[PDB]
Amino acid sequence: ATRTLVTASTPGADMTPGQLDYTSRPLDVALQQDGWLVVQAADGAEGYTR
C-alpha cells in the first residue's frame, strides 16, 4: 500500500463572533456568542442566522 490520495473538505463553519458596528438604529441587533436568530427559510422551513 503506497498510493494515498487527497480530498478537500469543508468541516462545518467557524462560530467565532466578529466585530460589532454600533449603528444608531433600534432594529439592528447582535446576538450573544453561540446564539442564533430564527427565520422562516425559503422553502417554508426553519433556518438560523446571525
Binding site: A1, T2, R3, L5
Partner: protein, 119 residues
C-alpha cells in the same frame, strides 16, 4: 513423421511465444481501462502441456486452450486495474528476444537440414 517430430518442440515454443505476446499486447492496450486485471500465462507449464497433448481451442469467436492467469498487482490503484507498465514492458521485451531466439534456432535447424539434402 521424423522431421515433423524433430522440429515440433521449437515450432510449438514459437507459437506459444506468439500467443503470449498477443496477451501482453492486450495488457498494454488495456493499461488505462479502469477495472482490468492483467493477464499472463505460465510459459513452461503450458509449453509442456501443448507438447504432450496437441493444441486445442475453446471454440472456432476462437481462442487458444491456454490458462489465462492473473498477475499479482504491485501497488493499488483507485480505478482498479493491475497493469503495471514496467512489468508489461519488461515482459514484452523479454518475449520479443525469446521469439527472435526461437526464429534463429528454427532457421538454423532448417538450414542444417538443407545443407545435408542439397547436392
Amino acid at each position: 513423421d521424423r522431421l515433423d517430430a524433430a522440429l515440433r518442440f521449437q515450432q510449438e515454443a514459437l507459437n506459444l511465444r506468439a500467443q503470449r505476446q498477443e496477451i501482453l499486447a492486450a495488457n498494454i492496450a488495456n493499461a488505462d481501462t479502469p477495472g482490468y486485471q492483467a493477464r499472463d500465462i505460465d510459459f513452461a507449464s503450458e509449453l509442456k502441456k501443448v507438447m504432450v497433448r496437441g493444441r486445442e481451442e475453446t471454440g472456432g469467436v476462437s481462442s487458444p486452450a491456454v490458462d489465462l492467469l492473473y498477475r499479482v498487482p504491485d501497488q493499488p490503484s483507485l480505478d482498479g486495474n493491475t497493469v503495471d507498465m514496467d512489468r508489461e514492458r519488461t515482459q514484452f521485451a523479454d518475449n520479443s528476444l525469446k521469439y527472435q531466439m526461437g526464429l534463429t534456432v528454427l532457421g538454423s535447424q532448417l538450414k542444417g537440414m538443407m545443407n545435408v539434402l542439397q547436392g
